[PDB]
Amino acid sequence: NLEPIFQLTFLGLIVLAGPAVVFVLAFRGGDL
Amino acid sequence: VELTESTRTIPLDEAGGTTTLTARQFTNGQKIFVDTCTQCHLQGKTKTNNNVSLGLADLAGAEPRRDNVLALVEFLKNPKSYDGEDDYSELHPNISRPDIYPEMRNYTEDDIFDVAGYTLIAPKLDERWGGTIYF
Amino acid sequence: MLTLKIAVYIVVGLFISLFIFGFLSSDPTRNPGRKDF
Amino acid sequence: GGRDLPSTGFAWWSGNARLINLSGKLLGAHVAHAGLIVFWAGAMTLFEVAHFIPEKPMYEQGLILLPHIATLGWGVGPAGEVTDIFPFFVVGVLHLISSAVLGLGGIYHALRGPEVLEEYSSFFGYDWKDKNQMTNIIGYHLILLGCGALLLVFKAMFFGGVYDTWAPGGGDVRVITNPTLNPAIIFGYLLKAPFGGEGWIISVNNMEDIIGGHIWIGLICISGGIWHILTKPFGWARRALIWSGEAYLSYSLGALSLMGFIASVFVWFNNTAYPSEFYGPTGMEASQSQAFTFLVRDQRLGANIASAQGPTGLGKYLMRSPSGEIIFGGETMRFWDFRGPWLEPLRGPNGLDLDKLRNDIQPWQVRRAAEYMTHAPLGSLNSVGGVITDVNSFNYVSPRAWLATSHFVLGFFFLVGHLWHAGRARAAAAGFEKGIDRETEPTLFMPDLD
Amino acid sequence: ELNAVDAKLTTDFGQKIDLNNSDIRDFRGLRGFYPNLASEIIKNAPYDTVEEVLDIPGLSETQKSRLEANLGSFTVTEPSIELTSGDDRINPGVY
Amino acid sequence: KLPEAYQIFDPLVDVLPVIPLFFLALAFVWQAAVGFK
Amino acid sequence: DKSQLTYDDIVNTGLANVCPEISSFTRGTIEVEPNTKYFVSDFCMEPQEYFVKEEPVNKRQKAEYVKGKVLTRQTTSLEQIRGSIAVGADGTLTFKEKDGIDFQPITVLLPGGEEVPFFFTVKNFTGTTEPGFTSINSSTDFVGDFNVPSYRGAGFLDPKARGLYTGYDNAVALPSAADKFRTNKKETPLGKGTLSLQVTQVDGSTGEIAGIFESEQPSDTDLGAKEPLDVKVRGIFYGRVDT
Amino acid sequence: MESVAYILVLTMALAVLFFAIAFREPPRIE
Amino acid sequence: ASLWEQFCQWVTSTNNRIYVGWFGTLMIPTLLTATTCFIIAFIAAPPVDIDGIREPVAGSLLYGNNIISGAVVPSSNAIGLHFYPIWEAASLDEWLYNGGPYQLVVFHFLIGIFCYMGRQWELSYRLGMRPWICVAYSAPVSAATAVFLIYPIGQGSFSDGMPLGISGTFNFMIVFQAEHNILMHPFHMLGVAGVFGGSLFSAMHGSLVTSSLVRETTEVESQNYGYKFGQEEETYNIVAAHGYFGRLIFQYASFNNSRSLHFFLGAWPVIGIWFTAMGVSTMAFNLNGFNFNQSILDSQGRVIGTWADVLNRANIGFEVMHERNAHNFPLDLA
């Protein structure tokens, strides 16, 4: 079913969002 | 073994006519059983009155006998006492009374057929179906 | 029974009072380190 | 502010202690966290709305937030039937959006705002040792807490009412018109014993007493707020308490632990503020429901339910409480203090009345008793309903069970946190939280014990 | 030495339904009996012979035909209080 | 169920409540990004 | 009086174990016709004093009753009992208990530490007066007999799981000595008791009657393990006669 | 009379507790 | 100089052989009360109708018990959660029949142990110590409160409290497994990890220290005489111990820090006992252990049993046999 595909995609986007913020702040040397 | 055709072959009425549920109908009846019936009819017992259980001897002993699909469908539309004398439409969940039984109000005729079919198939998968409360 | 109840109520009230007024009696100052507070 | 061990003396695993004297970053921590609480409120409400089957009882469906909203009188009708799904959705959306606002504000103050607020404003900047400012903040927040209790009062009296399970005609949303302002009843609830038959404040059994208590709480909290804005701590309070940020934290921890225990017991026993139409039956309710169900069933078969002795010699269906009240038999003798709207019509002055049990039992009481005895708060951790010896076909654990277990555990761990922060506050104010000084070790100057 | 219900199990109580001692659950094997006609049998007990189960007041014609149809499944022994005191005929503690 | 015009976002709502848990995880990640100092 | 009181007024106060009292000291009477049945509505029975006939080692010493203290609490009253008072041709009044809460298990403590449980009951009490009564008054003494069922039912299990219609019939913990105990064979015989209800107060305006009772009945045999002791119970009673 | 033996062993344990506390070997720094 | 200040100085005195303190003013009376009543009831109390079914259970030594079978039996099921002090009984014999000594002993004991925890803080404060020994003692306190108070509150009867006896404790455990499947409850599993691991770490730590003691004696005298009480030097070689244990498994599995190691020793069984106390406290509200009965089905739908199903058969046996005259109705709901 396509419901669980979207659930996993929304979950994967939310999961990557936090480490993305950390990764852009570490890659550009922000106020970590 | 597999869930064969003969395991899903159950009596339809009292005249010897039989019916054979599909796998989809068996799974829909099992789902309706888990969602609606099991709070009192877990493993074929009756937690509120275990003199009248879902075991095959008890279903055969009802008046008229309820070990076929049509009698079970008639019971879930108009439930009676075990001798078929007292009106139990305000005491047993049924599709004819949505105002007091809203959980059954969206179940179609084929949904009642499937849950009746599952009620007939489940005793031959379990030797403890319809026994005592602790068993 | 009533005499026992009154005696037990008095005994419990006296011990609880001691605890409350004991911990109200500058108990932060009763320590071997600093006691200004 | 130091963000490492060499500059703070606190490790990473104790990092938030680096904020104790950084009031701006502390405020941002506090405000982002509130974001989180309002976020869970909104997102959990939207989840519960999305999974809700409204013709099915809420307690069958793993819901702990929609019962709270339904008890306030939103989206429900008689017998707690769901009229409209939109108030629950509205409560969810408003919390979720606001939580976005609160999260943005906490991030600001935490990452960009000034790390200390004392050089910026005297009203907002605080020193933990400044007893006037600490009581000012207590006072502002007390006026707000009293306003919240008065908002519950306003919802019950002026803006649509609350769900009363005890309402005549059946339980319904009703507007409270005569709240109990009598302080004898309101504070005699505080004076009642925390034991069987008395139940302290868990035994509040009517909405008039609840709404009147919140009028008094609102009045008490508003008056105590002004008190603490206008006043300073007195000498006995100054000499009795520890005055530090960790100390005030630990005082709040002990308070939170107490309210967590009270909440777990409240949801386990009380069916008025936690109506059984939304939360399911209490355990006492379900046991009395089983005894009533089999009283009715055997009476229909012609048993003399009053003259029937059981195997022990006590009455099988009816027996006497230790003070003499006519109560249900078997193990539910323990639960003879239970009161419920389905049961109280069959009760007389002496207890359960024989005439009402013979010729006043209605079919809805039988239906409710069967439903409540089969929805007893017994269940496995993987949500298998009923007794633990039952097989896997009934997916049910009561919301009362989930809420009570959660809050008991939370309450216990917050008592542990109280002990940890109180003890540490005492040691840090006394100066030996980092260990015994070797030169001035106090035991080396004490005399020997024997 | 046997207790009294064991000695009753030696009799015809241990083979078929006794209108004076059998619990209501034993009437479920006859079609149309549980719960109403069995309750009327238990309430109007005792009986000296099987035949006076037909002389219960308030029996309908269908109930009389059902009782006549299942007359051979019934026995009558002496009423034993060990099975009848405290309404064990209605609820003997068996579920 | 959600109201009908919101029902296209039923899966996203289904993953909404566990976002605070990730926040507890996220701090550890940030400490891992700075060396757990 | 607990007539205007509610449940919340009576609960946990012990007033649910006491029989209603005829407030009116009216020494009235209730007129009765010579072949009519009058129903008794809420017959209550409050035991107050408890005695057990002691069993001495001597055979010909006087037996005598010794007072016992109740260990069970305020759970010792019969109430909500329906009955019938029929008047025969010769004015003989007959009290006949029908149903209600007509039994309480009561455990009393004797001097010496012997605990005597007994099945205090008025079950199927039939009690006659002297002939020649035209009313119910202060001279009405219903003297008669009632049934005493066994204290333990036949579904009771002893601490070694032996009972009458359930449980073992032998001492299973001692496999070579299992059938050598007479306590393996349980029995529940039907005992008999004597009850005198002496009416002392008749309120003819509402048909209320009150008075005293003296009762004698056997005690618990523990499924026939021991011989029953004789228990004498004295107390007070109330009822409402339906004219 | 087995109760006498039980009371004796429990009393011996409690008396050992009393003597082990009130008349312990006192700890001394030397 | 005042009489009250002199009493405050005596109560809080570090020179007392047994420290009293303000928590001790509550602990000493309560614990002495519960100890006296427990000893008297364990020796001589008459049988208690625990289940409220007029079937009194003999618990004391004088009524035929031994030390193993003896107990102070819980209060009557008829009492439930009702407060039953001595003065609410019509006689002492009624109070004894209904299990009043259990309520007296339990309530005083529980106050006494909470004040024991507070007294541990109090003496740590008066000695200039760090204050968290009482946090460690909160784990046995939480377990005692779980079995004596919290489980009766959740089940609605002190009759469901753990009896004050050895075989009564076993009865409590067995009935608890029958009704809650505590073995399949992940928090008991943490308790067991707590006590098994705590004993493991007790043995490892003791063995590693005893293995690495500095030679200070002869082999005639006991090695314990190589330690002087109050000596400044360390009595064992932590580097040898670490060099042993980091070769027994590998180097970074071994503590080189004594403070880190001692923290771990304190923390592991305390956390485990906290978890199992919360398991019993949550099973009070019948949030039971894992139910995997008929979790596995063959393609037809026939049950394939597992070890959980055999465990469930054992749980049934206990359940249908326990309090065998108490139940009148098909479900054990509390």
Ligand code: CLA
């Ligand atoms: C409720 C959870 C919570 C909150 C609100 C805080 C808040 C704070 N911590 Mg603590 N912390 C927590 C949990 C929390 N912490 C936990 C669980 C640990 C253990 C791992 C720590 C360990 C810790 C240490 C060791 C330190 C702090 C410090 C701080 C402060 C400065 C943070 C900083 O410099 O980050 C900088 C980090 C970043 C810039 C990375 C990005 C962080 C942002 C917030 C991500 C937000 C993502 C979010 C989805 C975006 C939404 C935006 C909008 C739509 C709303 C800040 C007030 C520091 C301190 O004391 O300051 C003096 C410090 O040294 N914390």
Ligand code: CLA
């Ligand atoms: C007060 C807190 C609380 C309570 C009572 C509930 C209760 C419930 N939730 Mg909700 N939930 C909560 C918080 C809560 N939740 C939070 C914070 C989140 C976000 C992560 C969610 C997200 C959520 C979702 C997404 C769903 C639920 C669902 C449910 C239901 C089934 C729960 C279940 O199967 O659990 C299983 C039991 C466990 C997982 C056990 C967890 C044990 C914890 C970790 C122990 C912690 C102990 C202690 C605090 C640790 C401290 C350690 C240290 C101090 C030493 C139930 C009604 C489900 C439902 O039916 O909804 C319709 C569902 O789908 N909840």
Ligand code: CLA
């Ligand atoms: C408890 C929460 C709290 C507290 C105490 C503060 C305190 C402060 N903030 Mg912060 N802030 C918060 C939340 C908070 N803020 C949130 C949630 C946001 C995001 C919207 C911000 C965003 C923010 C910014 C961007 C700035 C501040 C600034 C300031 C400082 C100056 C305040 C000022 O000018 O007030 C005087 C202002 C008023 C009296 C008007 C506002 C009145 C409020 C907003 C209306 C009603 C409140 C609310 C809507 C009621 C419902 C709330 C609900 C949760 C119950 C002060 C230290 C400034 C700063 O850092 O100074 C250096 C600054 O630049 N704040």
Ligand code: CLA
């Ligand atoms: C949550 C809000 C809050 C907080 C944090 C405080 C905090 C404080 N208050 Mg304030 N107060 C509040 C609300 C609050 N109050 C309200 C709403 C009112 C109005 C009624 C007042 C009225 C008030 C007055 C009149 C006074 C204070 C004072 C104080 C200070 C000392 C209190 C103290 O030592 O208590 C410790 C408590 C005691 C020493 C009393 C011992 C009695 C025993 C221990 C009670 C045990 C009860 C038990 C634990 C729980 C049972 C629950 C229930 C049945 C009772 C402290 C700063 C005092 C002060 O310095 O004034 C400026 C003071 O005189 N408060």
Ligand code: CLA
């Ligand atoms: C609102 C309540 C509150 C507040 C504001 C604080 C605030 C603080 N605490 Mg305290 N604490 C509390 C409650 C609170 N605590 C409770 C209830 C307990 C008992 C368990 C403790 C026990 C405690 C100890 C033992 C210590 C502190 C310390 C501290 C300081 C540093 C904390 C830090 O950086 O954490 C960093 C955060 C982490 C390392 C992460 C914690 C991980 C937990 C175990 C997760 C629990 C699981 C959770 C339920 C979700 C499950 C997720 C799962 C699915 C994976 C800070 C001042 C420290 C201190 O004394 O500083 C002076 C310290 O050593 N706290």
Ligand SMILES: CCCCCCCCCCCCCCCC(=O)OC[C@H](COP(=O)(O)OC[C@@H](O)CO)OC(=O)CCCCCCCCCCCCCCC
């Ligand atoms: C030498 C005598 C040995 C007795 C052994 C008895 C069986 C014990 C089996 C368990 C093994 C576990 C030991 C691990 C511990 C271990 O490794 O032991 C070693 C230890 C000697 O070791 P060390 O020389 O290093 O001494 C350590 C000292 O520094 C002490 O701290 O032996 C003992 O302590 C005494 C022997 C145990 C004695 C225990 C008491 C037994 C007496 C009980 C009899 C009462 C019955 C009453 C009826 C009369």
Ligand SMILES: CC1=C(/C=C/C(C)=C/C=C/C(C)=C/C=C/C=C(C)/C=C/C=C(C)/C=C/C2=C(C)CCCC2(C)C)C(C)(C)CCC1
């Ligand atoms: C500081 C810090 C921290 C913290 C942070 C925090 C705590 C935060 C937060 C935050 C928050 C608190 C947030 C938020 C948010 C929200 C949002 C973003 C929202 C929204 C919305 C929406 C978009 C919605 C939508 C919808 C609707 C409208 C309805 C329908 C459904 C849906 C869902 C679609 C940490 C730990 C990291 C550490 C470092 C530092």
Ligand SMILES: CC1=C(/C=C/C(C)=C/C=C/C(C)=C/C=C/C=C(C)/C=C/C=C(C)/C=C/C2=C(C)CCCC2(C)C)C(C)(C)CCC1
């Ligand atoms: C709303 C409501 C209500 C009402 C309620 C009320 C009215 C209340 C209250 C409340 C209150 C009124 C409270 C309180 C409290 C208190 C506390 C909780 C305390 C305490 C304590 C402390 C904390 C102390 C401490 C100490 C000591 C002991 C001594 C030394 C010093 C110190 C400080 C340490 C009712 C129920 C009607 C109904 C329902 C709703």
Ligand SMILES: CCCCCCCCCCCCO[C@@H]1O[C@H](CO)[C@@H](O[C@H]2O[C@H](CO)[C@@H](O)[C@H](O)[C@H]2O)[C@H](O)[C@H]1O
């Ligand atoms: C030092 C700190 C404070 C301690 C001082 C307190 C002293 C004692 C106060 C209360 C003790 C006596 O309090 C009194 O107890 C009896 C119990 O027998 C209660 O009496 C209650 O039960 C008895 C049964 O015995 C009934 O007869 C009575 O009708 C009923 O009201 C009273 O209602 C109560 O007022």
Ligand SMILES: CCCCCCCCCCCCO[C@@H]1O[C@H](CO)[C@@H](O[C@H]2O[C@H](CO)[C@@H](O)[C@H](O)[C@H]2O)[C@H](O)[C@H]1O
């Ligand atoms: C300082 C107190 C510390 C505890 C010490 C007290 C116990 C020491 C022994 C003295 C006890 C004597 O007290 C007496 O004991 C006997 C034996 O159980 C009890 O007798 C009890 O048991 C026997 C048989 O088990 C029964 O026949 C008797 O009917 C029953 O009451 C008495 O009721 C009690 O009064």
Ligand code: OEX
């Ligand atoms: O008491 Mn003690 O064990 Ca709790 O579960 Mn119901 O109660 Mn009775 O049974 Mn099973």
Ligand SMILES: [Ca+2]
């Ligand atoms: Ca349902």
Ligand SMILES: [Ca+2]
């Ligand atoms: Ca979905």
Ligand SMILES: [Cl-]
């Ligand atoms: Cl048992």
Ligand SMILES: [Cl-]
């Ligand atoms: Cl029961």
Ligand SMILES: [Fe+2]
């Ligand atoms: Fe060590």
